[PDB]
Amino acid sequence: AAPQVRTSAPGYYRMLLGDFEITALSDGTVDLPVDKRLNQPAPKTQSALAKSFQKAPLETSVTGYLVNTGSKLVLVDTGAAGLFGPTLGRLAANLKAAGYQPEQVDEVYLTHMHPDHVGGLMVGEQLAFPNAVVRADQKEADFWLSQTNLDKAPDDESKGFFKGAMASLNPYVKAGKFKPFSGNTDLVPGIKALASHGHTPGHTTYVVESQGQKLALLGDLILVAAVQFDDPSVTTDLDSDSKAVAVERKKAFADAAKGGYLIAASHLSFPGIGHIRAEGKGYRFVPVNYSVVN
């Protein structure tokens, strides 16, 4: 007779990294036809999913990462807001439930400008982080914010990716709040941009370092853990440069396994944080041990 509550706990996850505080912020999840996206036979993807006890369209987390360096509050990726269906757009509420207000964010860094990463930049026609400067790679902005690329896009879904980027960033560009970088660049003390182009022309990894503790925020360098850890060579039809993304993925996996530091990625099962170990033909992902933060 006790009612079922049936609400997930607030989607934020707290982790110390040296003297910095990290908060994975969930935007929700969305079901993706990953077998149709991956560049390999659908039964092969089907089987890899089933080995990890997944199938059919796959419920995929969408996550952004809040870094409090003690002097700046930085958000890496912003979820989708309302751009990508009604199951997403939760990052704003989870930012507040994690004890921060959007106005308190100093900078927003974008791994890339796909809709599930930039949508959160806007709430209606108002800036969602009115106090922040938005940073991403020059090559990312130059590709996605190009009117000519939009009008030449050969389908409504592609056009929609361009429109979503424009609707999400151009308010900041026009307000003088967009500050691009090019390639490997020191950002806020404690965070650097690391070029990992190929999923998109300007796709960027954000590397957080404090007191010798490292965390590489890989954005969309990996999209389907149950396939691409074992086989980092499998790509998707959403990658701008397949061979580049395979190179940059293998690079990040080998470097993280050698150094033994944490990685995170937007679409690993929330909170999406853990270590990586070279195993057999590929890699094994080891989710971070639950730790209470006081």
Q: Binding site for Zn(2+), residues?
A: 112, 114, 116-117, 199, 220, 267
- Which residue in this structure is represented by tokens 């969408």? 62
Q: How far is the CB of 148 from a second copy (least distance, A)?
A: 38
The item of a second copy, Zn ion, none sharing an interface with residue 130, based on CB under 5 to 8 Å by kind, is: none
The rounded distance, in Å, linking the Cα atoms of 122 and 130 is: 9
Q: Does 220 bind Zn ion (CB under 5 A)?
A: yes
* 150: Cα within 13 Å, side-chain hemisphere: 14
Q: Does 289 bind a second copy (CB under 8 A)?
A: yes
The rounded distance, in Å, linking the Cα atoms of 112 and 140 is: 6
Site string for Zn ion, 96-135 (x = CB under 5 A): ------------------x-x-------------------
Looking at residues 9 to 68 of the shown chain, list those that interact with a second copy (rule: CB under 8 A): 9-14, 16, 20-21, 23, 26, 28-29, 51-54, 59, 61, 68
Q: Does 168 bind a second copy (CB under 8 A)?
A: no
Q: Does 197 bind Zn ion (CB under 5 A)?
A: no
What are 285's strand-pairing partners? 276
Q: Does 124 bind a second copy (CB under 8 A)?
A: no
The rounded distance, in Å, linking the Cα atoms of 42 and 171 is: 40
Q: How far is the CB of 175 from Zn ion (least distance, A)?
A: 25
Where do contacts with a second copy occur on this chain (CB under 8 A)?
Answer: 1-2, 4-14, 16, 20-21, 23, 26, 28-29, 51-54, 59, 61, 68, 70-73, 87, 97-100, 104, 106, 260, 269-270, 275, 277, 286-287, 289-294
